[PDB]
Each structure stands twice: as C-alpha cells, then as structure tokens.
UniProtKB/Swiss-Prot annotation, chain H:
Subunit structure: Associates with the pre-60S ribosomal particle.
UniProt xrefs under InterPro entries: Mrt4 (IPR033867), Ribosomal_uL10 (IPR001790), Ribosomal_uL10-like_insert (IPR040637), Ribosomal_uL10-like_insert_sf (IPR043164), Ribosomal_uL10-like_sf (IPR043141), Ribosome_Assembly_uL10 (IPR051742)
Biological role stated in the UniProt entry: Component of the ribosome assembly machinery. Nuclear paralog of the ribosomal protein P0, it binds pre-60S subunits at an early stage of assembly in the nucleolus, and is replaced by P0 in cytoplasmic pre-60S subunits and mature 80S ribosomes.
Protein name: Large ribosomal subunit protein uL10
GO cellular component labels: cytoplasm; nucleolus; preribosome, large subunit precursor; ribosome
Keyword Magnesium (UniProt): no
GO biological process: nuclear-transcribed mRNA catabolic process; ribosomal large subunit assembly; rRNA processing
GO molecular function, one term: RNA binding
Keywords: Cytoplasm, Nucleus, Ribonucleoprotein, Ribosomal protein
Native source species: Chaetomium thermophilum (strain DSM 1495 / CBS 144.50 / IMI 039719)
From Swiss-Prot, chain I:
Subcellular location: Nucleus, Nucleolus
Transmembrane segments: none
Shown stretch of the complete protein: 154 to 204 of 661
Binding site for Mg(2+): S27, T47
Record's function text: Involved in the biogenesis of the 60S ribosomal subunit.
Source species: Chaetomium thermophilum (strain DSM 1495 / CBS 144.50 / IMI 039719)
Sites where the protein binds GTP: G20, F21, P22, N23, V24, G25, K26, S27, F45, T46, T47, K48, S49
Protein family membership: Belongs to the TRAFAC class OBG-HflX-like GTPase superfamily. OBG GTPase family. NOG subfamily.
Protein name from the UniProt record: Nucleolar GTP-binding protein 1
UniProtKB/Swiss-Prot annotation, chain J:
Family affiliation: Belongs to the NLE1/RSA4 family.
Shown segment, full-protein numbering: 260 to 517 of 517
Name of protein: Ribosome assembly protein 4
Species: Chaetomium thermophilum (strain DSM 1495 / CBS 144.50 / IMI 039719) (Thermochaetoides thermophila)
Keyword Disulfide bond: no
Subcellular location: Nucleus, Nucleolus
Amino acid sequence: NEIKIIHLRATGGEVGASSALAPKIGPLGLSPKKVGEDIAKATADWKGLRVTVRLTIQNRQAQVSVVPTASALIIRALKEPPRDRKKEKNIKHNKSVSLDEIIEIARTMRFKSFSKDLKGGVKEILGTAFSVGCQVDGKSPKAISDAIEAGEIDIPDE
Amino acid sequence: MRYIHSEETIPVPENVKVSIKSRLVTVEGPRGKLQKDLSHIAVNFSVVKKGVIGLEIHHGSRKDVAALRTVRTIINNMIIGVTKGFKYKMRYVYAHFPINVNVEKNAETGCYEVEIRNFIGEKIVRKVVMAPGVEVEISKAQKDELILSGNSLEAVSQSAADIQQICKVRNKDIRKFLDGIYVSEKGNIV
Amino acid sequence: PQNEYIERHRKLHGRRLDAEERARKKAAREGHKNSENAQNLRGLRAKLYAKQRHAQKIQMRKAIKQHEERNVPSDPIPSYLLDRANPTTAARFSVPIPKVRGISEEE
Amino acid sequence: SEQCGFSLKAQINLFKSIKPLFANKMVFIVLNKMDIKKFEELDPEMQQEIN
Amino acid sequence: KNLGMRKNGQVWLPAKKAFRPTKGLTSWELRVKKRQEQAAMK
Amino acid sequence: LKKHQAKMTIEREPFSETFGPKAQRKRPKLSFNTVDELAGYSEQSLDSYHARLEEKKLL
Amino acid sequence: AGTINKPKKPTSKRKTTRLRAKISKRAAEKKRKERKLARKNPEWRSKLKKDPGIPNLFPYKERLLQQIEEERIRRKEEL
Amino acid sequence: PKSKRARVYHLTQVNKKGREAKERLFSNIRETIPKYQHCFVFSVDNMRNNYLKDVRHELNDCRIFFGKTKLMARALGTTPEEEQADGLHRLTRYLTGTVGLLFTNRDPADIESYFSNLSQVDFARAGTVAPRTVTVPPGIVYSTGGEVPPEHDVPVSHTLEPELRRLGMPVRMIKGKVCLGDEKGEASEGYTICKEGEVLDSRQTRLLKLFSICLSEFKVSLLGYWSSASGEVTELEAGKTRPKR
Amino acid sequence: QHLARLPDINPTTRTLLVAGFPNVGKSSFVRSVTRADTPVEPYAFTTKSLF
Amino acid sequence: CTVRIWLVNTGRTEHVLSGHKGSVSCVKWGGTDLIYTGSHDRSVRVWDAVKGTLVHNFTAHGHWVNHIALSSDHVLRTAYHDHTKEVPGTEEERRAKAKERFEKAAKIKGKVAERLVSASDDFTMYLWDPTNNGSKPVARLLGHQNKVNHVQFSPDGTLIASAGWDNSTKLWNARDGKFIKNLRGHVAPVYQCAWSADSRLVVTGSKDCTLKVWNVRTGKLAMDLPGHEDEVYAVDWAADGELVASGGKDKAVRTWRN
RNA sequence: AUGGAAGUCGGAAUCCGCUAAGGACUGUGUAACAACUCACCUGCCGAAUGUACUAGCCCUGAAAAUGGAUGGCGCUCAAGC
Ligand SMILES: [Mg+2]
C-alpha cells in the first residue's frame, strides 16, 4: 500500500524513456511497455521537448504526470518548427517570445517559485529565457529584466 | 627587535604535583610520574598564582619568545599524560596472508615486545621493542586492533610509529598491495 | 588483469588506510620543501630549478591579474580570409646594416 | 521478460541485422532470465517468430 | 570537553592564542583616534 | 593530396580530442557502410593477411 | 649530501696576483665603458626627479602640510 | 618575517562583501521599519537554521532579517537619541547571539500560535545532549545505520568508508561493501555512536548526519515584540529568561 | 597505457563470443563460466570494453 | 552558426536556420525557395525557405567549406533585367519574366534542377544535384594542389571556374565535373574569379596585385591588368559586360574597360 | 551535445529569486545520481593585521680531478660586517 515517487527526464512522443526504467521498475513489478506507452500518452502534448515526468507507484500500478519546468515552457512557447532529433542536431532556440507569454509562464511556475511577487517570478523566467538563448519582444531578456527592475516595464500584480 | 618581557601560563589540576628545579620538570599525578629536562631553552619558571605556572623570557628575540609556546605545550602534555594518559589504537589489515601479532612482556627489561609474523607471507619474524612505560594489548572489542597506552605521549606515538615503519611493502605497487599496520585512533585513556 | 584493473581494485578494496593523511601531510610540507630546495640545491640543477620557479611565478601572477580583470583581427580582411592565420604585418637608399666587423685576410 | 529495457521485437531485429556477420560461424540464441519469465509464458506469434 | 575537531588529530592540543609579541603596547581607543587622524591627513 | 592528408586530418581532429582524458571522439571512421560490406571486407582482409604471412614465410 | 663525513676539495679564498690585477683592469675598463654609454645614452631623463614626499608615520605631517599651505598663501599675498 | 604561511588566492566568482553589505543592511532595515505594525525578535540557538527559508516562504507578507546581531542593533538604534522610532531601543536589549528580526502587520497572537505550532525534526549540533543511545550494528553497514530495518535499507556507499574511518569507526571494504568487522557480523561488537545523556561533539553529530539520524528539533523562540502604534515592547516567555545586552 | 592494459585475445583458437543488447546477462554468464572479473550491474553499458 | 531570414519591410526575423557547428561562411538562395549554406563544420546544407526546416545535409568535405555556387546565380542576381534594357510594365509580368529566365537557366534534360558546387579547404570540390541525386554527389572535382577559395558557374551553364591558393584557376565541365584546362600565370593565391555574360571570358583577381582576363575557349591569357599597389580582394564583372570592378588592400576602387 | 553527463568529460552563455550569504560552481566522488568540500554568510573568540615593493647581512646562483690554504693557528654578544 506504499507509494513511491520517481522523477525522470523524457522526450515527448517517445517510447524509449522506459529503457532506463526497466532496470529498477522491474523489481517493483511494473510493465515497461505499459509504462512507456502511458508516459508517451502523458507527454503527447510536448513533442520533441525534454520534459520532467513524475511516476506515482502504488499496488504495482503507476500514474504519470508532467511537472512543468521553465525551460520546457519557454521552448514550447517559442513555437519552433517540427524537427527530427536524430537528424537535425545542434539547434539553437533563437526565436522570440512575447512578454505576455512570459508572464503566463511565470503564473504557471508560481507553484514552484519562492519569490514574493509575480515580478520576481517574471524575472526568474527571463533569466531562464536568457539561458535558453531566445529573445523577449525582439530584445535581450537581460535588457527586459533590467527595464523591469528600473521601472520602465510594469508587471501586473498576481 | 628584542622584547623586554614575555609570559606564558600553564594551569595545573588539583591532583597534580609539579616540581621544577634547574629547568628539570617532574610532574606526578594519579597515573605516575613523568620527567623532562628543559635546560636547552632559557626560561624563568615561577608560580604566578595558586595552580598556575608562569613562564617568562627577558630581553629575548622573536625566536626566544616563540620557544615558550613549545615549552608550554610540552609541560601541558606531560600533565595530561599523568592525569588521563595517552592511547593510540592501531589496526592491521591484510588481503591474503593473515598478520599474526604476538605481544609479550620481557621480565628482564620490563618492556613489551611485539612480534609480527606472516606479513605478505614472509618467513621472517619482525620484532619491535616498545619504549618503557608503554603497555600494548590486543583489543577484544574489535578485529585486528592493537592498543598502545602510556603516560608519555612521545613514547606512545614513537612506538606506534615503529610498528608502522617495520611493516613496509617494498618493490610493489601500493595502489594494489594495501597490507600494513596503521594508527587508526589517537586519544586519551580516560 | 584487463582494462581499468587498478581503478576496479580501488573501488572494491579502497586504498591504504593512511593514504589520505600521508598525502595531506606531504602537501603541507611542500612549502618547507620548496624553500629548502631553493636554499640547498647546487650547480646546474639549482639554476634550472630557479629558472623553472621564475616561470611558474610569472604565470601565476598573470593568472591572478586575469582573475582580477574578469569583471571589466587588426587589418581589414574579407570574409574568406577571416579566422585564418594571417601575418601580423608589423631619398636615402641605405641598407639595414651599413657597417659590420671587417674580416682580415689572416682570419 | 524485457527487463533490460528493450523490446523483444527490437532484439530480434538486431539479430536479423547482424546475421550476415554470422556466416561460417555457429549461432546459439540464449534466452536468459527464466527465473523471471518462461518461454511458454509468451504469446504464440512471438514464439513462432523465435522458432 | 572539546566540541570541535582538530584537523591533524592531536585532540589534546590546547586552544592556542595568536602569537602577537607586541600585544598591549597600544590601546583600542587610541588606535581609533589615530585612525581618524590618519584618514583626515590622507 | 597525400603530402597534406596528414596535416589536414590533424587540423580536422586534434590529437587531444581523439584519445586521452579530454577526448571527444564518438563515431569511428569506417571503410564500410553496411553489414554485408563489413562481412565481405573481413573476408578480403583475412585473405590478404594470410597472403602476406605466406609471402613472409617464403621470404 | 655527504659533506660532513666526506668533504671535497676546498674552494681556496687565497687570491693570486694575476687574477687580482686582471680583475682590477676589468673593473676600470667597465667603469670607463659605462661612462661612455652614459655620455651617449639616448634614454629620456626627467629634468626634475620624482620626490618621495613626507612619510605617513611621521606624527606631524598634518601640521607640516598646514605650514606649507600657510606659506603658499603668504607668498601669494606678497606677490 | 620571511617565514610565513602563504595565502591562497581564490579563483572563484564570489568576493568578500565589506562595508557595502553593512550599509545595505542598514538601509534595508531602516526602510522596512515604517512599513510594518510590529517587530518581533526571535532566537534560534544551536540550530541548523536552514528552515528559515521555509519560514520566509510561509510568511510572505512579513520581512525577516537574519544578519549580524550588532549591525541589526545599530540599525534599530541602541540609544534613545539614535533610535529610528519611538521605543525601538527597548527592543534592542534582546539582540544577543543568533537572533532575527520579524517585521509584520499580522496579529501578534497569530505569530505566537504559528511559532508554537511550528515543529520540525533536525540534525543535532555539537553541544546538545543526546536523547537516546545510537549503535550501528556489526556486519554490513547500511545507509541509515540501523534506524530503519536493513531489509528496507540499502548498503552504504563505498565512498564514505575513508570518511567513516576518519570519524572513528573501524569499517573496512569487503568485496565492494562497507562492513563493520566481518561481513556476517563476526568478531566485532556494534559501534556506539552516542550514549544517552552524553553531550554530543561535532564528530558524533557528523556521523549522525551521515546516517541521517535526527536527534534534535528546529524551534524558533520569540523573545518580544515592539508595536509602532503603542511605541512599547512586550516581553514574552523566552525573553523573560534569556540573558540580555 | 591503454595498449598495455588491453586483454590478450587469440583470434585462432576455441572461442565463445557473447553478444546482445545491454542488461541481458552477458557479464553474468561470463562470470558464471569463467574466472574473469567483469562487473555485473543493472545499468546499460556496464561493460565498455572487451573482457 | 546561424542564418537569419529577415523581412525587409519590417526588419524582423522570420526564421532562424541553425544546426551548423561552425561559422556559416556562405549562403545562397535558389529560385525554388531553397537556402543553401556552407560552413566551417565541413558541411553543406539545403533548407526549406518557406518552412525553415532542414532538407538535406551533405557531409562529404574534409575541411572548411569556403564557398558554394548555384547554376542560376547569374539570372537570380538580376531578375528581369537583361540586354533589352527595358522593364515590363507591371509586377506580375516582371515576376513572370524573372521566373522564365530562371527556369531557362536551370533546366536539365527539360526539368528544372539547380546544381550546386561547393569548394573546400580539402583542395577539392563537390558537385550536387539535390533534386535528382539527393545526398549522392554528382562528382568530386580533383586537381587543385592547395585550398580552393572561389567557385562560379558560367552563365550558359557549361563551365565551372575555380580559383585556388595554388596560384591557379581551373576549368571544369558543369555536367559531369570533368577537368578541362588549367589557367596558369598568377604568382600568388587567386582570391576571386568572375565570368563574363557571354561565357567566353573569366577575370581572376589575385594576391599578386593583378587581374587577369582569360579566354576560356582558347584557354589562354587574353589580357593582363596590373595597377593595384596591393592585394586584390573583390572582383566583379558587370552583367552587361561593360566594366570590371576591382578593390583591395590599396583602398582605391579600380574600374576596367575594353 | 553524449550510450550515459544532474555545478565538477566537453562547447557556448553565465541571469533571476531568497537573501545574512551562497559560482548556472573550487576540488574529491558516481556509469549517472547521491555524498563530501571550496568560494561567500552567521554565531563563539578577542586587537591588531594583510599584500607588494625597498634596503642591509645570510643561503643558492655550476664544479672537476696528488693533500692545502682569509699567510697559518684559529675565531661565533668575533679575532666577521
Ligand atoms: Mg548491465
């Protein structure tokens, strides 16, 4: 009757995420093909993106969920063309994302953020966007963050 | 630059008797008596307070002022030795050939003797004679452990060093051959 | 034995029980040892040692200056010449060496 | 039992792919881990593929 | 008893003090006043 | 071409990136592309090796 | 080294007349040559040397600076 | 002095703070004083204090300062002439040792109830008295050291074996497993990490943290608060008994 | 150094060559039939060389 | 390592083509909405311009890919402009004229197929026909003894000209990549080459401070053009053939006429 | 990007929150994690220190080959400077 939580990284719309799982979920009594197809069904929203999946295991069945991360949300909001990960490598995420979508991602990530305010959450998402390498409103995310801190850009409260 | 006056202090426990004459220090406690000649260092000993030994140097250089700290630590370790004692635990570990350690006490000399056999299968018997005042026992609580106790910290540590030095692996890769007798713990008897 | 057998031996059996303490103490004695080598070596070995120490001191100072300054081609060339190894490139009709040591016929 | 993490169809496909290397050699397919799952526990058509 | 660990394992070593052989020549208040005067002069 | 093949290969892949603690080489360079080509190549390699051994034994 | 138990041939501190004379001649020649490179030295030299100033640990540097400023004011008033 | 310990230069990003940190702390406290109705002084003595992050997250509408004690005392003002607000210098008598400021607009009864109900297990620091005797059983050493049953436990990592020997257990590496004595628990008694009633030292607390054994608890004790409207300081139960300066 | 630590394989003697996907029991079989010290672990590519 | 597509009227980026591991040293835009890129990661890529997705990845070269050329570059640079010196009245017929010029330049066996040639530092070239061959090269062009700097098709599509660092310009058949003749006479690395509109003549500008006009049918040095005091970096021949422009390290534009 | 790569095999960026402070990490470690450690911060303590240069005197800064030379004994708060 015990509950085990296993967190993993997976690519959406893929079956081979259970390749590493079957060494350890096998003693637990789970079916690797079943949990792989079930993970793919959960991550069918997030094609081509590395996402974090939580597995809740009780009485030898597993329930899957997708834990939202800032990097996955930003790369999904970038709206990149569909690509083959086997043939098209060394890609760069150099498109642009709007500041409204940045605030929406921050509202999504409020459940993880320890910041006091949505402005702090937005600045965290802007830093993650700067790491990813995209643009916000055609400018640098660092420049947008500096504008937010200096007061030119106003973030709505909650 | 010569410093006019420099002072150190050594507190003395209630059960310890310390006698200094001509820079020859004798410290007696519940566990026995230790003696050390400190005539190689110029120092004025005094009783600055009840239960405090004062050390002074007059018109000394920085090196002369610095030697008082060594004298302080030496006399303090003698006091600790006659009060609580010193105990070094050694562990002998082996891969294939079990190390056989035999401890005897020589009635003629009064010292302990440690005999080491079958070190990496060698047919020689290694013999180490302890310094006087050092007692050696084989521990029954743990496996393959010697215990060296005494009042003199220098004697106990040098005896442990002798046992560590005599079992040395030669002409082998020490990443592979891990055999030896090693000091595993240092502390007080009490 | 085969492949990384000493690493496997370290993983299965560890090392000698005093290895960490001996390594720490030797590293701690390195300062006294370096000064002793500077003051006690003789001859060509001492000279090579001193030149090597001079080189390491210079490189350390350069690295220190770079870490201090962490928080702060020349000639126009076309695109097909970019990222290549290009040379640095820096009346009286006099030669660069107008006078040399004269050579006698006996020499 | 596919506790290695790979599909048995993929294992059969790998064997079929490397069969041209097996000329002039003898081949024994060892089905491992019978303490977990037996060959009789398989569905009929995959048994037919292995035979 | 001792609560902290000594790095070299000689746990009987006492809690030593800093080696300042010129200790006690100048007080703290006088040095503060001299600090202010030297800062003004600089 | 052959007077510069060696320098060209070293410029493409330095010695430190090929083998060593900081090596980044993952896919090898192969003279074959398919499994059937590999089997045929192994057959010709074994035949040539035996031919060289017989020539050296004769010499 | 095994210097104490087996010392080597000693390095003599007794000078010879030939070496003393040669060293004296070489020192005189070096002095003259240094004078020659000094008289044809093309290196720039300042007209006024960089004066070190007053030490900080001098206790009366502040009143000496007061004296300097007062002397400047008096000289400006006189001129 | 030619003979000298050589100082190592740190080739890392973070530099020393200096006086700018002190001025920033002063300005932050002096600008957060007028915005809040109450200022509580709390103490966390001989505690790991990493749960103050969770306390800060839970009390998002408050402001917690956990800086230097003397700097916070000078920021509040220790004398009536230098105080920022009327009656703050009565509050500064509680600032000794490991203290923190809590500026809030909530009811003080709510704060007292929250910090009375706040309970969290914690690793003991050196100087605490051990509530129970802990003994690692002989044989194969497991990750928890015998707190959970071994069949639910996992064997301890082989990289901790030099560390455990340094902290004083005679453990050994038998075929890739850390064992106390023999693999079948022979020729060795269990290792007593601590005994009940014994004052723990840092070696024992380090062993307990390595074996994930929590022998202490985290508790924030409120000493007293100052209200901006009344301009007076109310003494609480911990502040009645704690020494003051 | 790598060549010095290579295993010695005679290409023209009696030899049993074990192949397959990872995590199927190749190292377990070789340990069970020989004296070779090849590691057996549940993760893929435990064995990265020829033993 | 990126190619950005810009909308000229607004100045914003529509697509970012990424995937190269080295600097994209040359980009071309064909008449079928394909973008061809060569890079320092030894690769030549064909991208879909409308979608921004990679279509082909050719990895045959052994060093830096310095330059790529298309069989239709001469008509794609000029669109509807030609020898008549008159422009059609409206945009639709102007686009039709440009498209029919491109298709006339790009027909191979009655089908529109753009040929691509890539010159590299591995002393060689590769000839690609992505429509009919895919990733299989038509030919490898061998013969330069040093790095190949510039490559260009002739306007009539029969010849390929190559400038190399071995002081030579070489001519190749544009259909099967077969070597024809060597143009010898420069004494320093030849940096650029440029065709005349009638495909009789190629002018090459080199590091030896000279331009040389070569008759490719005779295979000889037609004209020698000295006058630059330093290296010649940029060479162009006008589409109507009236002028040749050269520029380089001596900071002055030089124009050359018959 | 990698079979794997979670600060720590690599390439490029290197921002924000919470801050008292904590690098998109200084090293040890793992197959990868974990674990430890450093930078930085707080508490205990208690008053002067740290860095680099300059000047003296001392050591090293290259030596062969019979046994030898501050002229010799010898000299160490000098019988040296
Ligand atoms: Mg495995």
